Amino acid sequence: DMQVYIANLGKYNEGELVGAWFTFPIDFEEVKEKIGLNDEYEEYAIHDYELPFTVDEYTSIGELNRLWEMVSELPEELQSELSALLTHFSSIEELSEHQEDIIIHSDCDDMYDVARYYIEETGALGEVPASLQNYIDYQAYGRDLDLSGTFISTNHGIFEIVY
Amino acid sequence: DMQVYIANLGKYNEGELVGAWFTFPIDFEEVKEKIGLNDEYEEYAIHDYELPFTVDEYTSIGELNRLWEMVSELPEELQSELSALLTHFSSIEELSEHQEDIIIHSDCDDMYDVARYYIEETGALGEVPASLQNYIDYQAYGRDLDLSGTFISTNHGIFEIVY
């Protein structure tokens, strides 16, 4: 759970490759004494990992401890879908800039229900007469809410990135 | 134009059948002297006609003069489509009972425009918000206006028989 397999730059041939699992936070010296060395300090071969995001094989461990703070800062419904938010954003820092703009529809599951929420519950367009209340198109209004703003659909609800 | 070919019960064999055209009103004696007789008074063989409605071959001429008053009483948009009104009613007298109930949409031509008239112009269901004004289904509301009341479609406009 949110861990790495970080050893080693020594043994490029990887004869009985070592270094199993380290959760966060991470010491340099504890991992270095866990995995040894190649008589000098070149380590953190990030071979395997298990993270909600993507990281390269040459990333410094300080950047991993930097990113872990911002990842563990967020609530679980954000942390369950960090790659889905990364499909619109570009970094965890940029997500941390706008981490209150994202509106979460746990109740709504598809665009019909999003339109029905914005019309029936909120009254964003105005009051709804009851004889009109059944005769309102939701699909075309849902398509125009899709083409106006930016909506992302996940398993839990619908994420709405607002400006 | 609204006339008949009424001769004769004499000459069942119709050897040089006579009696050409008589508009309304109709005399018994003028037609009888126009077409002759068979030494007695049996006449008004209604063979051909040209009328906005349907009449049988044994109808008395007094009933024709009776019906012509009610037919010529109506305005031309009713008189242009008397058979279309007869598809819902049963007689010209019954049409004369309810001759003010029929509402005429010269402007509207199909059920989409009838729904758009009842919603946008009248506001039968209430006020229309402008951001809602495009997102209102008219086809389903038109189908339910069709299945609720009684609408008849002609060349000129739409006839609405109201209760």
XYZ file of C-alpha atoms in Angstrom:
326
model
C 0.000 0.000 0.000
C 1.753 3.096 -1.411
C 5.253 1.625 -1.391
C 8.294 0.952 -3.598
C 11.001 -1.630 -4.377
C 14.074 0.607 -4.329
C 17.413 -1.192 -4.832
C 19.979 -0.917 -6.389
C 22.129 1.013 -8.865
C 24.951 -1.315 -7.898
C 24.705 -4.782 -9.477
C 23.541 -3.670 -12.903
C 23.584 -7.408 -13.652
C 21.204 -7.681 -10.644
C 22.589 -11.000 -9.401
C 20.239 -11.704 -6.484
C 18.732 -8.235 -6.645
C 17.700 -6.944 -3.226
C 15.636 -4.297 -1.466
C 12.030 -5.084 -0.823
C 9.497 -2.644 0.558
C 9.543 0.798 2.147
C 6.452 2.797 3.030
C 6.517 6.510 3.676
C 8.404 8.451 5.065
C 11.761 7.097 3.886
C 15.219 7.407 5.408
C 18.296 7.382 3.208
C 20.405 5.548 5.775
C 17.856 2.929 6.870
C 17.226 1.848 3.270
C 20.964 2.047 2.517
C 21.791 -0.265 5.412
C 18.873 -2.513 4.452
C 20.132 -2.948 0.879
C 23.872 -2.380 1.243
C 25.875 -0.467 -1.353
C 28.412 -0.907 -4.158
C 31.223 0.628 -2.001
C 29.854 4.095 -2.900
C 26.549 5.979 -2.652
C 24.484 5.283 -5.758
C 21.107 3.765 -4.905
C 17.304 4.112 -5.291
C 16.793 1.970 -8.357
C 13.021 2.417 -8.474
C 12.115 -0.863 -10.132
C 8.631 -1.693 -8.869
C 6.131 0.441 -7.013
C 2.529 0.639 -5.892
C 1.284 4.229 -5.958
C -1.884 6.024 -7.102
C 0.218 7.950 -9.646
C 3.114 7.326 -12.033
C 6.786 7.881 -11.193
C 10.000 7.307 -13.137
C 12.905 5.000 -12.336
C 15.363 7.840 -11.590
C 13.292 9.912 -9.154
C 15.045 11.122 -6.007
C 13.601 9.850 -2.739
C 13.174 13.409 -1.478
C 10.759 14.050 -4.333
C 8.863 10.918 -3.299
C 8.585 12.198 0.274
C 7.570 15.565 -1.196
C 4.773 14.023 -3.260
C 3.572 11.741 -0.453
C 2.612 14.733 1.709
C 0.333 16.152 -0.981
C -1.101 12.722 -1.803
C -1.875 11.905 1.836
C -3.302 15.409 2.343
C -6.301 14.718 0.099
C -9.522 12.928 1.104
C -10.031 9.309 0.112
C -12.482 9.971 -2.734
C -9.798 12.102 -4.372
C -7.091 9.553 -3.541
C -9.178 6.763 -5.073
C -9.183 8.561 -8.451
C -5.918 10.500 -8.670
C -5.116 9.266 -12.178
C -8.591 10.323 -13.333
C -7.852 13.821 -12.066
C -4.429 13.597 -13.714
C -6.200 13.045 -17.053
C -7.141 16.748 -16.856
C -4.416 18.281 -14.673
C -0.648 17.871 -15.063
C 0.870 17.534 -11.571
C 0.046 16.898 -7.937
C 1.137 20.460 -7.128
C -1.331 21.831 -9.681
C -3.986 19.585 -8.147
C -3.031 21.033 -4.760
C -3.551 24.562 -6.095
C -7.145 23.820 -7.122
C -8.005 21.121 -4.571
C -11.179 22.901 -3.418
C -12.579 23.631 -6.890
C -13.461 19.987 -7.560
C -17.135 19.351 -6.802
C -18.066 15.725 -6.157
C -21.424 14.152 -7.016
C -21.591 11.001 -4.941
C -25.338 10.939 -5.612
C -25.199 11.482 -9.377
C -23.749 8.732 -11.552
C -24.397 9.868 -15.140
C -25.129 13.058 -17.047
C -28.914 12.620 -16.909
C -28.751 12.671 -13.112
C -26.348 15.633 -13.160
C -28.818 17.626 -15.261
C -31.699 16.495 -13.027
C -29.723 17.654 -9.980
C -28.905 21.078 -11.424
C -32.508 21.640 -12.526
C -34.754 20.000 -9.925
C -32.692 20.453 -6.755
C -30.833 23.717 -7.302
C -33.093 25.542 -9.723
C -30.109 26.934 -11.600
C -32.304 28.001 -14.523
C -35.199 29.125 -12.317
C -38.423 27.779 -10.887
C -39.897 24.555 -12.233
C -43.670 24.349 -12.807
C -45.027 20.923 -11.898
C -46.902 20.491 -15.177
C -43.647 21.478 -16.891
C -41.563 19.357 -14.485
C -41.923 16.193 -16.545
C -41.693 17.939 -19.929
C -38.093 19.165 -19.649
C -35.387 17.657 -21.842
C -32.444 16.517 -19.736
C -30.305 14.782 -22.361
C -29.681 17.823 -24.566
C -29.116 19.989 -21.496
C -26.728 17.319 -20.245
C -24.828 17.388 -23.543
C -24.562 21.159 -23.363
C -23.340 20.997 -19.766
C -20.751 18.518 -21.036
C -19.665 20.783 -23.890
C -19.707 23.943 -21.765
C -17.716 22.910 -18.692
C -15.428 19.996 -17.881
C -16.902 16.860 -16.305
C -15.097 13.615 -15.442
C -16.906 10.355 -14.664
C -15.603 7.767 -12.195
C -16.909 4.803 -10.208
C -17.949 6.782 -7.125
C -19.687 9.855 -8.534
C -18.978 12.637 -10.996
C -16.055 15.016 -10.570
C -16.709 18.565 -11.770
C -13.697 20.830 -12.227
C -15.104 24.330 -11.922
C -13.433 27.637 -12.694
C -71.192 25.300 -56.386
C -73.419 23.684 -53.725
C -76.018 22.332 -56.139
C -77.834 19.146 -57.202
C -79.103 17.218 -60.247
C -82.633 16.412 -59.086
C -84.821 14.598 -61.646
C -86.737 12.280 -61.824
C -88.594 9.415 -60.141
C -90.571 9.096 -63.352
C -88.671 7.365 -66.173
C -87.014 4.690 -64.068
C -85.520 3.604 -67.404
C -84.199 7.210 -67.586
C -84.634 7.552 -71.352
C -83.160 11.020 -71.926
C -82.990 11.744 -68.213
C -83.535 15.418 -67.428
C -83.149 18.044 -64.721
C -79.858 19.825 -64.519
C -78.871 22.239 -61.786
C -80.586 24.048 -58.930
C -78.801 26.150 -56.337
C -80.352 27.101 -53.036
C -83.119 27.930 -52.083
C -85.281 25.523 -54.091
C -88.911 25.765 -55.152
C -90.988 22.638 -55.624
C -92.978 24.111 -58.500
C -90.117 25.758 -60.413
C -88.115 22.517 -60.472
C -91.283 20.530 -61.238
C -92.064 22.705 -64.249
C -88.399 22.606 -65.271
C -88.310 18.794 -65.296
C -91.941 17.884 -65.955
C -93.624 14.956 -64.220
C -94.895 11.413 -64.790
C -98.569 12.595 -64.652
C -98.302 12.582 -60.827
C -96.098 14.157 -58.143
C -93.102 11.914 -57.522
C -89.821 13.736 -58.112
C -86.448 14.740 -56.578
C -84.337 11.847 -57.772
C -81.107 13.099 -56.212
C -78.662 11.543 -58.647
C -75.648 13.853 -58.650
C -74.722 16.668 -56.314
C -71.922 18.992 -55.297
C -72.054 19.724 -51.570
C -69.530 19.945 -48.716
C -71.322 17.032 -47.009
C -72.972 13.736 -47.945
C -76.678 13.291 -48.697
C -78.759 10.299 -49.775
C -80.768 9.801 -52.955
C -84.169 9.921 -51.198
C -83.773 13.122 -49.169
C -86.686 15.563 -49.228
C -85.922 18.984 -50.675
C -87.162 20.664 -47.499
C -84.399 18.911 -45.582
C -81.920 20.225 -48.154
C -83.178 23.778 -47.635
C -83.022 23.099 -43.887
C -79.386 21.999 -44.056
C -78.348 24.806 -46.417
C -79.183 27.455 -43.803
C -76.860 25.885 -41.236
C -74.140 25.278 -43.831
C -74.241 28.857 -45.131
C -74.350 30.178 -41.551
C -70.780 29.066 -40.830
C -67.587 30.948 -41.752
C -65.574 29.840 -44.761
C -62.786 28.110 -42.816
C -65.434 25.860 -41.281
C -67.192 25.432 -44.635
C -63.907 24.456 -46.290
C -63.535 21.491 -43.900
C -67.052 20.339 -43.018
C -66.295 16.669 -43.664
C -63.235 16.911 -41.404
C -65.493 18.184 -38.634
C -67.971 15.430 -39.510
C -65.216 12.883 -38.793
C -65.736 13.765 -35.106
C -69.339 15.000 -34.950
C -72.430 13.280 -36.369
C -74.693 15.970 -37.870
C -74.811 19.579 -38.987
C -77.269 20.309 -36.165
C -74.800 18.930 -33.616
C -72.107 21.061 -35.242
C -74.464 24.028 -34.894
C -74.845 23.320 -31.171
C -71.088 23.543 -30.578
C -70.130 25.950 -33.375
C -68.275 28.312 -31.017
C -66.261 25.638 -29.188
C -64.002 24.957 -32.177
C -60.736 26.883 -31.838
C -58.829 27.447 -35.075
C -55.039 27.661 -35.360
C -54.400 29.337 -38.684
C -50.850 30.014 -37.488
C -50.051 26.513 -36.227
C -49.733 23.705 -38.759
C -48.495 20.702 -36.750
C -48.398 19.500 -33.159
C -44.923 20.906 -32.471
C -46.208 24.392 -33.276
C -49.368 23.804 -31.220
C -47.250 22.910 -28.187
C -44.954 25.883 -28.856
C -48.016 28.147 -29.009
C -49.516 26.860 -25.758
C -46.186 27.148 -23.932
C -44.383 30.192 -25.341
C -47.311 32.469 -26.201
C -49.946 31.638 -23.598
C -47.861 30.355 -20.716
C -50.447 27.702 -19.910
C -48.007 25.852 -17.646
C -46.480 29.031 -16.205
C -43.564 31.354 -16.804
C -40.727 30.292 -19.084
C -37.133 31.055 -18.034
C -34.995 32.033 -21.013
C -32.207 29.590 -20.165
C -34.940 26.955 -19.852
C -36.759 28.256 -22.953
C -34.723 26.147 -25.358
C -34.538 23.088 -23.086
C -38.250 22.214 -23.073
C -39.478 19.075 -24.816
C -42.316 19.895 -27.196
C -42.834 16.528 -28.893
C -43.803 14.561 -25.781
C -45.971 17.440 -24.580
C -47.527 17.506 -28.042
C -48.266 13.776 -27.844
C -49.877 14.228 -24.449
C -51.969 17.136 -25.723
C -53.026 14.801 -28.533
C -53.941 11.989 -26.142
C -55.640 14.300 -23.637
C -57.954 16.364 -25.839
C -59.207 16.028 -29.403
C -57.263 17.699 -32.219
C -57.984 17.547 -35.960
C -55.463 18.578 -38.622
C -56.445 20.164 -41.941
C -54.832 22.175 -44.733
C -55.512 25.608 -43.233
C -54.628 25.210 -39.557
C -55.507 22.946 -36.657
C -59.064 22.561 -35.401
C -59.372 22.029 -31.648
C -62.709 20.775 -30.336
C -62.774 21.902 -26.723
C -65.191 20.929 -23.977
